[PDB]
């Protein structure tokens, strides 16, 4: 199955590394737990933002152009990206917006972190039919000495 994992600021705004200001080690732990030993698919801009492969995961990068880094696997279409994951229980799609838009209709699960942070940005997580999705887990945390903002983890499954 295909899953999307994303961090959503106020108004479901999404973005890249330098554009997302919070410091949420708890969310990084959540992301790691939920993606480790699974293939991760990302767009080229997300790849450039991260700057180095995510360890212990197959990193698959979408780009219309030839690859430019042998440390990751490069593909030129959504269907090629999925095929490059092989036969695994769960494929993790880690954005960005253009990639989320394409994979959402194919996805069975969403892993969302709803962060109580107001950020500059025009880009939002794709609109999806709320009635298409059942919330199966959520867990709220206030900010603390390590985490700059309050945040809520949520898993939704397609119903
Ligand atoms: N300044 C602003 O107001 C503003 C607003 C919104 C976004 N942005 C910028 O936009 C970028 C983030 O956009 P994003 O989150 O949408 O990026 P993303 O999903 O991480 O990456 C998009 C890239 O992935 C590749 N890709 C996606 N689908 C593909 C497909 N089906 N086949 C082949 N390649 C595919 C393309 O790479 P190739 O280009 O290599 O073909 C595409 O340009 C950042 O650089 C951000 O700064 C800026
Ligand atoms: N839950 C979640 N949080 C986020 O901030 C993001 C998503 N999802 N999805 C898309 C994008 C992912 C950004 C992103 C980039 C690098 C690492 C990373 O380096 N993670 C390491 C652990 C880092 C640490 O332990 O400090 C990892 O091994 O997963 C995590 C997230 C932003």
PDB file of N, CA and C in Angstrom, residues 3-9 12 14 27 30-31 34 92-93 100 104 109-115 125-126 128 133 135 137-140 151-157:
ATOM      1  N   UNK A   3       1.266   5.162   1.278  1.00  0.00           N
ATOM      2  CA  UNK A   3       0.965   6.088   2.348  1.00  0.00           C
ATOM      3  C   UNK A   3       1.655   7.419   2.088  1.00  0.00           C
ATOM      4  N   UNK A   4       1.021   8.499   2.505  1.00  0.00           N
ATOM      5  CA  UNK A   4       1.649   9.823   2.487  1.00  0.00           C
ATOM      6  C   UNK A   4       1.986  10.210   3.908  1.00  0.00           C
ATOM      7  N   UNK A   5       3.144  10.849   4.120  1.00  0.00           N
ATOM      8  CA  UNK A   5       3.482  11.393   5.434  1.00  0.00           C
ATOM      9  C   UNK A   5       3.885  12.849   5.251  1.00  0.00           C
ATOM     10  N   UNK A   6       3.290  13.698   6.075  1.00  0.00           N
ATOM     11  CA  UNK A   6       3.441  15.135   5.926  1.00  0.00           C
ATOM     12  C   UNK A   6       3.311  15.845   7.254  1.00  0.00           C
ATOM     13  N   UNK A   7       3.934  17.020   7.332  1.00  0.00           N
ATOM     14  CA  UNK A   7       3.800  17.960   8.437  1.00  0.00           C
ATOM     15  C   UNK A   7       3.008  19.155   7.922  1.00  0.00           C
ATOM     16  N   UNK A   8       1.900  19.457   8.592  1.00  0.00           N
ATOM     17  CA  UNK A   8       0.984  20.531   8.181  1.00  0.00           C
ATOM     18  C   UNK A   8       0.977  21.630   9.209  1.00  0.00           C
ATOM     19  N   UNK A   9       1.309  22.831   8.759  1.00  0.00           N
ATOM     20  CA  UNK A   9       1.253  24.018   9.586  1.00  0.00           C
ATOM     21  C   UNK A   9      -0.185  24.464   9.624  1.00  0.00           C
ATOM     22  N   UNK A  12      -3.028  24.013   6.915  1.00  0.00           N
ATOM     23  CA  UNK A  12      -2.457  22.904   6.151  1.00  0.00           C
ATOM     24  C   UNK A  12      -1.370  23.338   5.176  1.00  0.00           C
ATOM     25  N   UNK A  14       2.265  23.547   3.723  1.00  0.00           N
ATOM     26  CA  UNK A  14       3.431  22.664   3.649  1.00  0.00           C
ATOM     27  C   UNK A  14       4.597  23.385   2.988  1.00  0.00           C
ATOM     28  N   UNK A  27       8.535  15.041  16.295  1.00  0.00           N
ATOM     29  CA  UNK A  27       8.006  14.777  14.968  1.00  0.00           C
ATOM     30  C   UNK A  27       9.053  14.073  14.115  1.00  0.00           C
ATOM     31  N   UNK A  30       8.797  10.491  15.072  1.00  0.00           N
ATOM     32  CA  UNK A  30       7.593   9.941  14.445  1.00  0.00           C
ATOM     33  C   UNK A  30       7.838   9.638  12.961  1.00  0.00           C
ATOM     34  N   UNK A  31       8.459  10.585  12.269  1.00  0.00           N
ATOM     35  CA  UNK A  31       8.766  10.388  10.863  1.00  0.00           C
ATOM     36  C   UNK A  31       9.710   9.209  10.679  1.00  0.00           C
ATOM     37  N   UNK A  34       8.014   5.799  11.387  1.00  0.00           N
ATOM     38  CA  UNK A  34       7.019   5.441  10.385  1.00  0.00           C
ATOM     39  C   UNK A  34       7.579   5.235   8.976  1.00  0.00           C
ATOM     40  N   UNK A  92       6.200   4.781   1.357  1.00  0.00           N
ATOM     41  CA  UNK A  92       6.006   6.078   2.007  1.00  0.00           C
ATOM     42  C   UNK A  92       6.325   7.212   1.054  1.00  0.00           C
ATOM     43  N   UNK A  93       5.351   8.076   0.849  1.00  0.00           N
ATOM     44  CA  UNK A  93       5.497   9.237  -0.006  1.00  0.00           C
ATOM     45  C   UNK A  93       5.711  10.458   0.880  1.00  0.00           C
ATOM     46  N   UNK A 100       2.569  14.811  -3.538  1.00  0.00           N
ATOM     47  CA  UNK A 100       1.381  14.481  -2.764  1.00  0.00           C
ATOM     48  C   UNK A 100       0.113  14.503  -3.633  1.00  0.00           C
ATOM     49  N   UNK A 104      -1.968  10.985  -3.663  1.00  0.00           N
ATOM     50  CA  UNK A 104      -3.124  10.932  -2.785  1.00  0.00           C
ATOM     51  C   UNK A 104      -4.241  10.012  -3.298  1.00  0.00           C
ATOM     52  N   UNK A 109      -3.347   5.397   3.237  1.00  0.00           N
ATOM     53  CA  UNK A 109      -3.111   5.940   4.574  1.00  0.00           C
ATOM     54  C   UNK A 109      -2.439   7.282   4.487  1.00  0.00           C
ATOM     55  N   UNK A 110      -2.788   8.140   5.432  1.00  0.00           N
ATOM     56  CA  UNK A 110      -2.129   9.438   5.631  1.00  0.00           C
ATOM     57  C   UNK A 110      -1.572   9.483   7.044  1.00  0.00           C
ATOM     58  N   UNK A 111      -0.302   9.872   7.163  1.00  0.00           N
ATOM     59  CA  UNK A 111       0.327  10.123   8.439  1.00  0.00           C
ATOM     60  C   UNK A 111       0.580  11.629   8.508  1.00  0.00           C
ATOM     61  N   UNK A 112      -0.165  12.324   9.355  1.00  0.00           N
ATOM     62  CA  UNK A 112      -0.116  13.782   9.375  1.00  0.00           C
ATOM     63  C   UNK A 112       0.323  14.262  10.732  1.00  0.00           C
ATOM     64  N   UNK A 113       1.139  15.306  10.754  1.00  0.00           N
ATOM     65  CA  UNK A 113       1.434  16.021  11.996  1.00  0.00           C
ATOM     66  C   UNK A 113       0.862  17.414  11.856  1.00  0.00           C
ATOM     67  N   UNK A 114      -0.131  17.721  12.678  1.00  0.00           N
ATOM     68  CA  UNK A 114      -0.798  19.018  12.639  1.00  0.00           C
ATOM     69  C   UNK A 114      -0.100  19.920  13.639  1.00  0.00           C
ATOM     70  N   UNK A 115       0.674  20.870  13.127  1.00  0.00           N
ATOM     71  CA  UNK A 115       1.549  21.698  13.962  1.00  0.00           C
ATOM     72  C   UNK A 115       0.937  23.068  14.146  1.00  0.00           C
ATOM     73  N   UNK A 125      -1.376  21.232   1.703  1.00  0.00           N
ATOM     74  CA  UNK A 125      -1.556  19.806   1.484  1.00  0.00           C
ATOM     75  C   UNK A 125      -2.793  19.618   0.590  1.00  0.00           C
ATOM     76  N   UNK A 126      -2.790  18.615  -0.307  1.00  0.00           N
ATOM     77  CA  UNK A 126      -3.946  18.484  -1.206  1.00  0.00           C
ATOM     78  C   UNK A 126      -5.238  18.385  -0.456  1.00  0.00           C
ATOM     79  N   UNK A 128      -8.616  16.840   0.096  1.00  0.00           N
ATOM     80  CA  UNK A 128      -9.166  15.529  -0.135  1.00  0.00           C
ATOM     81  C   UNK A 128     -10.508  15.466   0.537  1.00  0.00           C
ATOM     82  N   UNK A 133     -12.058   9.417   4.246  1.00  0.00           N
ATOM     83  CA  UNK A 133     -10.968   9.093   5.163  1.00  0.00           C
ATOM     84  C   UNK A 133     -11.495   8.964   6.570  1.00  0.00           C
ATOM     85  N   UNK A 135     -10.277   8.755  10.546  1.00  0.00           N
ATOM     86  CA  UNK A 135      -9.190   8.957  11.469  1.00  0.00           C
ATOM     87  C   UNK A 135      -9.104   7.734  12.351  1.00  0.00           C
ATOM     88  N   UNK A 137      -6.171   7.131  14.441  1.00  0.00           N
ATOM     89  CA  UNK A 137      -5.254   7.378  15.542  1.00  0.00           C
ATOM     90  C   UNK A 137      -4.994   8.864  15.582  1.00  0.00           C
ATOM     91  N   UNK A 138      -4.942   9.435  16.773  1.00  0.00           N
ATOM     92  CA  UNK A 138      -4.445  10.796  16.928  1.00  0.00           C
ATOM     93  C   UNK A 138      -3.823  10.934  18.303  1.00  0.00           C
ATOM     94  N   UNK A 139      -2.865  11.845  18.420  1.00  0.00           N
ATOM     95  CA  UNK A 139      -2.156  12.011  19.663  1.00  0.00           C
ATOM     96  C   UNK A 139      -1.557  13.407  19.739  1.00  0.00           C
ATOM     97  N   UNK A 140      -2.098  14.203  20.656  1.00  0.00           N
ATOM     98  CA  UNK A 140      -1.715  15.599  20.824  1.00  0.00           C
ATOM     99  C   UNK A 140      -0.642  15.781  21.886  1.00  0.00           C
ATOM    100  N   UNK A 151       1.698  20.060  18.705  1.00  0.00           N
ATOM    101  CA  UNK A 151       1.546  19.243  17.504  1.00  0.00           C
ATOM    102  C   UNK A 151       0.646  18.054  17.811  1.00  0.00           C
ATOM    103  N   UNK A 152      -0.038  17.563  16.781  1.00  0.00           N
ATOM    104  CA  UNK A 152      -0.876  16.384  16.900  1.00  0.00           C
ATOM    105  C   UNK A 152      -0.584  15.426  15.768  1.00  0.00           C
ATOM    106  N   UNK A 153      -0.176  14.219  16.125  1.00  0.00           N
ATOM    107  CA  UNK A 153      -0.019  13.143  15.162  1.00  0.00           C
ATOM    108  C   UNK A 153      -1.392  12.598  14.812  1.00  0.00           C
ATOM    109  N   UNK A 154      -1.582  12.208  13.566  1.00  0.00           N
ATOM    110  CA  UNK A 154      -2.830  11.577  13.136  1.00  0.00           C
ATOM    111  C   UNK A 154      -2.514  10.582  12.048  1.00  0.00           C
ATOM    112  N   UNK A 155      -3.197   9.448  12.099  1.00  0.00           N
ATOM    113  CA  UNK A 155      -3.210   8.508  10.989  1.00  0.00           C
ATOM    114  C   UNK A 155      -4.642   8.395  10.497  1.00  0.00           C
ATOM    115  N   UNK A 156      -4.821   8.592   9.202  1.00  0.00           N
ATOM    116  CA  UNK A 156      -6.108   8.368   8.538  1.00  0.00           C
ATOM    117  C   UNK A 156      -5.991   7.199   7.575  1.00  0.00           C
ATOM    118  N   UNK A 157      -7.052   6.413   7.451  1.00  0.00           N
ATOM    119  CA  UNK A 157      -7.106   5.318   6.499  1.00  0.00           C
ATOM    120  C   UNK A 157      -8.292   5.509   5.570  1.00  0.00           C
TER     121      UNK A 157
END
